[PDB]
Design a protein around this ligand. Structure first.
Ligand SMILES: Nc1ncnc2c1ncn2[C@@H]1O[C@H](COP(=O)(O)OP(=O)(O)OP(=O)(O)O)[C@@H](O)[C@H]1O
Ligand SMILES: Nc1ncnc2c1ncn2[C@@H]1O[C@H](COP(=O)(O)OP(=O)(O)OP(=O)(O)O)[C@@H](O)[C@H]1O
Ligand SMILES: Nc1ncnc2c1ncn2[C@@H]1O[C@H](COP(=O)(O)OP(=O)(O)OP(=O)(O)O)[C@@H](O)[C@H]1O
Ligand SMILES: Nc1ncnc2c1ncn2[C@@H]1O[C@H](COP(=O)(O)OP(=O)(O)OP(=O)(O)O)[C@@H](O)[C@H]1O
Lengths: 449, 138
């Protein structure tokens, strides 16, 4: 970590031309211009993200060296400062996989039966990149018509077969195109199956020799364990922004309500192996949310817990000292309570930071500028709302779209002159980063409306 | 004249005017034809209507020139066959193309499995004395 005066004076001496380092150190003077963040929020006007700007700094790195590593909770760390919000219109098992493959996390919504949410977590934890998650296996006793219609039900039509569920053969459209029989289709003969679990790059070579559309994965017990489809091997991408646990499989979260009826929901999700819980609540500082927090920390000491919504340092205190490991900092983005979001993020982040409990800036974020801001104010991660609805993952593709936001954040944190979000926040709290207010006349002219 | 030729030679199940590529052809100028004509299973011999087939599955992992199928294809129409006979050969063979070859042992016509899924009875034939389609010209 080095200041703009330290970096300019040092990097000038890398190029080359005394008692100028010895009379003021690496702080070789820079003009004071604009407000430190502590001054910006001193007026007690409740600002939001449209109301301030970040005065540009000194640039000495490319827009692709802006390390984005952020911290979700005290122990979970993410390669990307984004998240998908726990809403029915946004996150389900598909978007939860997509976010984790882009280095973020997703939280499965809770507007469902508890069993359905535990199934959607199980579906995310067991992803395996190349393999088909939850394959459809049919029984040698079925007549072909009830396989041939599945193409009308699920759309795919190369069905592996064995006694009831996870091999004795396969059936495909090519076995069925000309016809109703009950069993006349390919018995065990398969051209180079995987004898055990195998590396995806080994299967990529096996499909090239075999020319078939499916590749069974079997075991020493001479039975199925997984299956590969050729069409997915044609398209599977590199994902270096992994978002994986210590067991090397995808991270995901779940929302839970705070009701008395929710110790049961929380069991089923912790049995499905969920990594982190967000306590969904319109206002988090309630006696029965603090009871719910104490209850989780007493029963599942491994599970990370993100505190339900707050906007004051007084709320943040009561949830922190209850033991929570995070915080959704957002409320009221017609109801008579709430706070202007920019002031909420700054005040809660600045308070939580005293303990190390990163926060999560949820609410009213609708541009990449607002994202860069929320991250300059103190938020550790930004939770993307209905911004992700009307993508193809929403219950135009999240995998193709997230890189845009990443490049935008990187360009921003390059103009600000901070090589990594952790440095961006260090540069803000130390008062090196300078901000400016904006009259309505200054935002009615320069975008926004 | 070309359109009329195309119309007189219809044959119902067979592909009218199939595309043959030359074994001396690196796969990129075959692989793009999928971008030009849309189809991508191509039979392969010296210039016109021998070795087997180059097909999307042979190319979908890859540059090379003819490291694909030699003369080693499955059961095929040995001289010329009824459409009902080829329909039974495609069932056993499971492969997507079925060549027809002459007594000189070269390609003379080809069938695609996708078209055998959708061919029909046409009792309203409109065929000439040589049993092929009538057509007119302005
Ligand atoms: N046995 C299976 N069980 C569950 N899902 C499957 C199975 N086989 C294929 N799928 C689904 O279908 C998708 C495409 O697979 P594939 O291209 O192999 O389909 P297919 O079996 O060849 O279908 P079709 O014969 O109609 O073209 C996979 O990504 C997966 O989502
Ligand atoms: N791994 C395998 N080993 C051997 N035979 C297989 C294997 N997988 C599928 N088959 C069989 O090979 C033939 C072609 O199967 P394939 O998977 O290539 O068809 P498909 O891709 O599902 O159909 P389509 O070409 O219409 O998309 C069928 O008879 C099928 O049952
Ligand atoms: N070799 C060919 N020469 C000319 N036309 C062909 C040929 N193969 C396919 N076609 C065209 O495509 C139709 C048959 O499609 P087919 O199922 O054979 O495509 P395909 O080669 O399997 O394509 P793809 O590999 O992309 O799936 C025919 O009616 C014809 O219009
Ligand atoms: N009649 C044939 N006899 C033997 N092999 C064939 C024959 N026709 C095609 N092949 C080869 O068999 C493999 C599968 O080709 P096929 O026509 O059966 O399906 P395909 O064109 O790859 O279908 P798809 O692209 O939809 O999966 C390829 O290696 C191809 O070159």
């Amino acid at each position: 970590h080095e200041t703009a005066a330290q970096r300019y004076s040092a990097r000038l001496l890398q190029a080359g031309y005394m008692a100028d380092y010895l009379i003021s150190g690496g702080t070789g003077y820079v003009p004071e211009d604009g407000l430190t963040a502590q001054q910006l929020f001193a007026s007690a006007d409740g600002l939001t993200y449209n109301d301030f700007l970040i005065l540009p700094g000194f640039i000495d790195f490319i827009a692709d060296e802006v390390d984005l590593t952020s911290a979700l909770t005290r122990k979970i760390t993410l390669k990307t400062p984004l998240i998908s919000s726990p809403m029915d219109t946004v996150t389900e098992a598909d978007m939860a996989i997509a976010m984790a493959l882009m280095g973020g996390i997703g939280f499965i919504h809770h507007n469902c039966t508890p069993e359905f949410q535990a199934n959607e977590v199980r579906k995310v934890k067991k992803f395996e990149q190349g393999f088909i998650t939850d394959p459809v296996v049919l029984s040698p006793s079925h007549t072909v018509g009830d396989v041939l219609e599945a193409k009308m039900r699920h759309g795919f039509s190369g069905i592996p077969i064995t006694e009831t569920g996870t091999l004795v053969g396969i059936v495909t459209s090519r076995d069925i195109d000309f016809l109703l029989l009950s069993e006349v289709m390919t018995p065990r003969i398969e051209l180079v199956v995987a004898p055990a679990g195998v590396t995806l790059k080994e299967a990529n070579e096996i499909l090239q020799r075999s020319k078939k559309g499916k590749l069974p994965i079997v075991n020493d017990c001479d039975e199925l364990v997984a299956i590969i489809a050729r069409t997915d091997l044609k398209k599977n991408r590199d994902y270096p922004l992994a978002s994986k646990d210590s067991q090397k499989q995808l991270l995901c979260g779940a929302a839970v309500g705070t009701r008395e009826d929710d110790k049961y929901r929380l069991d089923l999700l912790t049995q499905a192996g969920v990594d982190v819980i967000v306590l969904d609540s319109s206002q988090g500082n309630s006696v029965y949310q603090i009871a719910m927090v104490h209850y989780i920390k007493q029963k599942y000491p491994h599970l990370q817990v993100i505190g339900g919504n707050v906007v004051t340092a007084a709320q943040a205190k009561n949830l922190i000292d209850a033991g929570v490991d995070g915080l959704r900092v957002g409320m009221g983005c017609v109801m008579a309570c709430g706070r202007p979001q920019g002031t909420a993020v700054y005040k809660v982040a600045e308070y939580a930071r005293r303990f190390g409990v990163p926060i999560i800036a949820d609410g009213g974020i609708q541009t990449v500028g607002h994202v860069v801001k929320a991250l300059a104010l103190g938020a550790s991660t930004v939770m993307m709302g209905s911004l992700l609805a009307a993508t193809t993952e929403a219950p135009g593709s999240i995998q193709k779209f997230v890189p845009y936001l990443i490049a935008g954040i990187q360009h921003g944190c390059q103009d600000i002159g901070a090589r990594s979000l952790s440095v961006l926040r260090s540069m803000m709290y130390s008062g090196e980063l300078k901000f400016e207010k904006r009259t309505m006349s200054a935002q009615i002219e320069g975008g926004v409306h």
